[PDB]
Write an enzyme that holds these catalytic residues in place. Structure first.
Site, PDB file in Angstrom:
ATOM      1  N   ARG A 292       0.837  -1.193   0.000  1.00 32.54           N
ATOM      2  CA  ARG A 292       0.000   0.000   0.000  1.00 32.54           C
ATOM      3  C   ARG A 292       0.872   1.243   0.000  1.00 32.54           C
ATOM      4  NH1 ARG A 292      -5.277   0.684   4.006  1.00 32.54           N
ATOM      5  NH2 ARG A 292      -5.559   2.904   3.539  1.00 32.54           N
TER       6      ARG A 292
ATOM      7  N   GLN B 299       2.159   1.538   3.607  1.00 30.39           N
ATOM      8  CA  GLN B 299       1.910   0.378   4.442  1.00 30.39           C
ATOM      9  C   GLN B 299       2.549  -0.869   3.855  1.00 30.39           C
ATOM     10  OE1 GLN B 299      -1.991  -0.062   6.529  1.00 30.39           O
ATOM     11  NE2 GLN B 299      -1.940  -2.089   5.593  1.00 30.39           N
TER      12      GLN B 299
ATOM     13  N   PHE C   3       3.152   1.168   8.932  1.00 33.53           N
ATOM     14  CA  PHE C   3       3.139   2.125   7.834  1.00 33.53           C
ATOM     15  C   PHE C   3       3.931   3.361   8.230  1.00 33.53           C
ATOM     16  CE2 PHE C   3       0.299   5.345   9.483  1.00 33.53           C
ATOM     17  CZ  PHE C   3      -0.430   4.666  10.423  1.00 33.53           C
TER      18      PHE C   3
END
Ligand SMILES: [Zn+2]
Ligand SMILES: [Zn+2]
Ligand SMILES: [Zn+2]
Lengths: 271, 154, 51, 48, 67, 96, 234, 97, 51, 48
Positions: free
Chosen positions: B44, B52, B102
């Site tokens: 991500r 992330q 993250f």
């Protein structure tokens, strides 16, 4: 506020043979062929019938249906069924929007916008002004065309060439523009009504395109989030720094002026 | 407490906030010691929000802590997301922290709630700034695999 | 145009590519490591203005 | 596309990018040229 | 060109070269079709999809022999 | 077929044309010219200014005409490999 | 599996159950000029059936509705959208170039990358409304009497005009202004000339409208613009 | 390979017999918040393939389009070029005919 | 086409992320076509017709 | 028709006779093939 009346009691029947010696009907393309091409702009025979909203408009069977279209033949004035007709016999008003693909007059819009700018506009371009050409009697061309055009709809701009019989009335709406185009063809003011071409004026193009943004803005502002709408005027009619502290408490446009689930505004309340 | 992340874009160094949140940082520390973060995709990446990653599956789901499934998050007042580079944890509920984490790319003041803050990136922030410009498909996922070659803790 | 013009427009054949409405085949340079970014948009003013 | 092995065309394209101050375009073009023809030294020399 | 024997149909048109395909080689394992041409390039084809997998540009002149 | 051609067009592009006993010579010429161009492109080493195909083809045509007219066709400056290849292809054409 | 056509629910009817037919290769796209299948359905009883007008390659490159030609995010005509928002460059209007662009664009769009995201569209819309609101907010003496007296004789640093009672802005604004000052016959105007002349059914209405006087006036193309330049020195 | 080539061959061969394949297909359909509004209820829609007139000629003309651009070329990867010298440059100089 | 038959209680299937807030209402929905999600359903004719 | 050959008359006995003298262009364009003529003659026999 009275039922619509029929214009033509008879049905105009088709029987005609151009250039008696040298023409023969063509079965596939239903038109006479052979003989001299003849001027492209010569056949135009002045229209016989003419209509006005005042003595002709009225109720019809199509008023009941919400999505009904106007009579192709009322505007040209040979709708021979009257109130029994399946299309509206009245005049388009301000809020009579239709789908983009469909012509506002009931027909369908192609994409090539033709070459002689003849029949129906193109969905790919949005223009509201139409070329009208014909008689150039005297200097009162401006007033005669204004009288003969304003009764078809709402007008935004009229420009008439003094040297030659050319006028470029610009209508406010597509509906009135195309209704006037189909109502002022081969009429007496025969008129050579066509569609307008892209303006070569660097100044006229700028104002036309600005009109396009203001129409877009009117369309879209009903969809933007309420906070954005209200803040647009709060900034212009109130102090600014007094609320950044509240914003600083919890700062970008896309981050804050955004809808959808899991956005900050939804998250802020749910905390 | 200190961990290096050998990422594809470059070198990422993290100093852990053991003094603030000890329980949630020891797992990351010993996890880099075990080092199954090798070949783990940053699944991500959102321009100006986060990067992330940390799941061995690579499907945006999974990730096992040393405790095995999840644990309890500890948050106190002085912690904030006021900067771009705060290294925090990823969860899917009240106390649902997993091995994946993250990195913050912009001040997220609204996020100082259910997310545990346990790191600050001292060096290599330019690597994260470049990661913010990675080609991403329709979903928040890079098209090319943004694997972590190695994660050495020091 | 000297004394009084009708603004004569040139006559294209009905069979033309027109070579002016758009790029004839419109192939763009392949994107490389280094970002163009500004190099073109920074001077869109100039894309039209050098012309 | 017609022929990517023609060195004069590569050099012409590079040179026309140097004319119009497009330095980042030209350097991307060198990258493509040297990654396509690693064994011709004209492109490498122009790049360095 | 790939022809079905029975129906005389040209199922695949493996068009990737720039000049005459001077050589050919076919097998059962993938790569199934290997064509070397005037370009000095050898192309390894995926007969199932009719698309090239690997291009071999090591040669300097036309590759007239494949085996 | 008539109705399809009426409602569709020629579809002339992409169709082959068999050799029908009138195109035999003009096609044999194309194949021989292509073969000689291939051999030229091969025997010339790297970086020897490849722009020499048309002149060698002219030399080959002149050699063929000289053979037809029984004339020696002995050229001063021609390199040995080009001369040998031209002789080979001329002999092929003469045997045909 | 060539399953369904992208059609907006405004023109899919307000019935949660519709029946529609498909005929493969029955039409050519009105942009692609490529073979495409038609889908015909009834929006509501008492209406001619609708039908798709463009292929599925289009309405994907344009994020639009195959039937009513309205974009699926803003619900306004696609032509007006691409003219005003100017989100991403459009295609040409000529046939061969547009079909080549459409085909290769469909190919690269099927390659996986989406050509339309809505983040930039919402941003462009808010920017557009912002720009609209911002848009909301001796030599002169000789060009003064060069023909002002001349035309008057033929057919009729600072200068102050006179008011007599002898017996950007479109014309419809003038029309909905003079309705309280009497019925209207015709209003002939020109932006370049900046002169609007109005006609009523009676001269009394015109004169009472003129009596409202204490921006307003009371009683080639360049020839009519000589007095129009006076607005800078009025 | 057998399945792929057979599929392509069958598609090619299919291109006179009247087609007889009519059967409804039902589609469960989910609207997605197009112009804001309030989304819409889920819909199921009946597909029926309208049968074609056996007498219809080809519906429309087929026009040619220039072939699209190919994939980018691969790197060359040659052995280093050798030196030929002016003597060998001249030894391959051919006279005019 | 999930291949492993699995007990129900772990079917909540969380996404396990910080819930990206930049997304707008158009992309909140999962879809195949541009307009929405469509899938096959084997409804007998009579029930569809009557309802 | 649909070919523009509206000057050719197909009388009711299926004889294709031009209604006027044809130039070389018209004579070349109005030339039909064996299929059309064979069908015309079969139709003539049927009409007989
Ligand atoms: Zn009517
Ligand atoms: Zn629609
Ligand atoms: Zn299309």
């Amino acid at each position: 506020k009275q039922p619509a009346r029929k214009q033509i009691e008879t049905r105009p029947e088709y029987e005609m043979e151009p250039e008696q010696p040298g023409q023969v009907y063509n079965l596939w393309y239903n038109k006479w062929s052979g003989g001299m091409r003849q001027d492209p702009l010569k056949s135009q025979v002045k229209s016989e019938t003419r209509c006005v909203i005042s003595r002709d408009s009225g109720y019809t069977k199509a008023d009941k249906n919400p999505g009904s279209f106007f009579c192709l033949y009322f505007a040209r004035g040979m709708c021979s069924e009257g109130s029994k007709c399946e299309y509206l016999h009245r005049l388009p008003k301000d809020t009579d929007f239709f789908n983009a693909n469909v012509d506002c007059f009931g027909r369908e819009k192609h994409a090539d916008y033709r070459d002689d700018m003849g029949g129906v506009g193109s969905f790919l371009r949005q223009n509201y002004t139409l070329y009208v050409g014909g008689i150039t009697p005297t200097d009162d061309i401006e007033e005669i065309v204004s009288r003969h055009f304003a009764e078809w709809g709402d007008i935004e701009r009229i420009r008439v060439l003094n040297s030659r019989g050319i006028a470029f009335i610009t209508y406010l709406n597509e509906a009135n523009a195309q209704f006037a185009k189909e109502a002022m063809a081969h009429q007496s003011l025969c008129l050579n009504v066509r569609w307008a071409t892209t303006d070569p004026n660097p100044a006229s193009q700028a104002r036309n395109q600005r009109r396009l943004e203001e129409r877009a803005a009117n369309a879209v502002k009903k969809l933007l989030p309420k906070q954005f709408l209200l803040d647009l005027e709060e900034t212009k009619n109130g102090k600014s720094g007094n609320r950044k502290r509240k914003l600083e408490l919890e700062p970008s446009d896309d981050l804050l002026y955004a809808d959808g689930a899991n956005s900050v505004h939804n998250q802020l309340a749910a905390n | 407490a200190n961990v290096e992340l050998q990422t594809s874009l470059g070198k990422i160094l993290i100093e852990l906030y053991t003094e603030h949140a000890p329980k949630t940082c020891q797992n990351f520390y010993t996890l880099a010691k075990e080092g199954y973060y090798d070949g783990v995709i940053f699944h991500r990446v959102i321009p100006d929000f986060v990067i992330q990653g940390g799941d061995p599956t690579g499907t945006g789901r999974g990730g096992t802590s040393i405790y095995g499934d999840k644990f309890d998050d500890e948050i106190h007042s002085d912690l904030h997301h006021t900067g771009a580079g705060i290294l925090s944890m990823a969860n899917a509920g009240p106390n649902t922290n997993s091995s994946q984490f993250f990195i913050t790319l912009a001040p997220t003041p609204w996020l100082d709630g259910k997310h545990t803050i346990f790191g600050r990136v001292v060096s290599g922030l330019s690597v994260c700034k470049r990661m913010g410009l990675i080609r991403t498909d329709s979903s928040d996922r890079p098209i090319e695999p943004l694997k972590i070659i190695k994660a050495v803790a020091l | 145009k000297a004394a009084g013009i009708n603004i004569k427009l040139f006559r294209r054949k009905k069979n033309e590519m027109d070579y002016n409405a758009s790029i004839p085949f419109e192939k763009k340079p392949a994107i490389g490591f280094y970002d163009t970014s500004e190099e073109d948009r920074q001077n869109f003013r100039e894309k039209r203005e050098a012309d | 596309d017609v022929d990517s092995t023609y060195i004069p065309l590569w050099l012409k394209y590079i040179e026309c990018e140097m004319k119009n101050r497009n330095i980042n375009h030209a350097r991307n073009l060198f990258d493509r040229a040297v990654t396509q023809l690693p064994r011709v030294d004209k492109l490498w020399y122009k790049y360095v | 060109r790939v022809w079905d024997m029975r129906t005389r149909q040209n199922v695949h048109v493996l068009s990737g070269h720039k000049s005459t395909v001077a050589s050919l080689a076919v097998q059962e394992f993938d790569p199934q079709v290997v064509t070397g041409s005037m370009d000095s390039t050898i192309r390894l084809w995926d007969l199932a999809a009719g698309k090239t997998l690997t291009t071999l540009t090591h040669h300097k002149k036309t590759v007239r022999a494949l085996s | 077929n008539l109705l399809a051609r009426q409602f569709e067009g020629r579809h002339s592009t992409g169709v082959a044309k068999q050799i029908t006993k009138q195109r035999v010579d003009s096609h044999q010429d194309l194949e021989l010219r292509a073969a000689v161009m291939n051999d030229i492109l091969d025997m010339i080493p790297e970086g020897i200014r490849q722009g020499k195909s048309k002149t060698i083809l002219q030399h080959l045509s002149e050699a063929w005409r000289c053979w037809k007219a029984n004339i020696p066709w002995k050229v001063p400056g021609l390199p040995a490999p080009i001369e040998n290849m031209i002789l080979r292809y001329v002999k092929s054409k003469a045997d045909w | 599996d060539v399953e369904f056509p992208s059609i907006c629910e405004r023109c899919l009817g307000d019935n949660s159950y519709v029946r529609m037919t498909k005929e493969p290769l029955g039409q050519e796209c009105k942009i692609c000029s490529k073979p495409c299948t038609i889908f015909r359905w009834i929006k509501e009883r008492g209406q001619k059936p609708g039908k798709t007008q463009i292929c599925v390659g289009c309405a994907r490159y344009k994020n639009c509705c195959q039937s009513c030609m309205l974009d699926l995010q803003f619900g306004l005509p696609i032509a007006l959208r691409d003219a005003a928002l100017k989100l991403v460059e459009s295609g040409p209007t000529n046939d061969i170039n547009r079909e080549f662009f459409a085909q290769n664009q469909q190919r690269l769009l099927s390659n996986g990358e989406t050509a339309y995201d809505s983040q930039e569209a919402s941003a462009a819309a808010r920017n557009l409304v912002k720009k609209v609101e911002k848009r909301e907010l001796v030599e002169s003496k000789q060009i003064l009497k060069e023909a002002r007296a001349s035309d008057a004789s033929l057919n009729a640093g600072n200068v102050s005009l006179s008011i007599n009672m002898e017996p950007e802005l479109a014309d419809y604004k003038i029309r909905k202004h003079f309705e309280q000052y009497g019925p209207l016959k015709s209003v002939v105007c020109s932006h370049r000339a900046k002169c609007a002349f109005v006609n009523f059914k009676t001269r009394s209405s015109a004169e009472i409208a003129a009596a409202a006087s204490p921006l307003k006036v009371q009683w080639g193309p360049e020839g009519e613009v000589r007095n129009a330049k006076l607005a800078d020195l009025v | 390979t057998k399945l792929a080539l057979q599929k392509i061959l069958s598609k090619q061969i299919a291109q006179a017999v009247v087609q007889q394949r009519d059967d409804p297909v039902y589609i469960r359909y989910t609207p997605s918040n197009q112009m804001g509004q309030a989304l819409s209820k889920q819909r199921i829609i009946k597909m029926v393939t309208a049968e074609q007139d056996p007498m219809e000629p080809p519906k429309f003309r087929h026009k040619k389009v220039p072939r699209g651009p190919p994939s980018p070329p691969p790197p060359v990867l040659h052995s280093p070029p050798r030196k030929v010298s002016a003597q060998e440059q001249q030894d391959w100089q051919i006279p005019p005919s | 086409e999930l291949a492993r038959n699995v007990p129900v209680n772990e079917m909540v299937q969380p996404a396990l992320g910080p819930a990206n807030p930049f997304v707008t209402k158009e992309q909140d929905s999962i879809k195949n076509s541009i307009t929405g999600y469509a899938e096959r359903e084997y409804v007998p004719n009579f029930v569809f017709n009557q309802e | 028709h649909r070919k523009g050959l509206t000057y050719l008359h197909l009388d009711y006995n299926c004889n294709l006779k031009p209604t006027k003298t044809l130039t070389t262009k018209e004579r070349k364009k109005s030339r039909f093939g064996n299929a059309f003529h064979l069908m015309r003659e079969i139709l003539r026999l049927t009409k007989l």
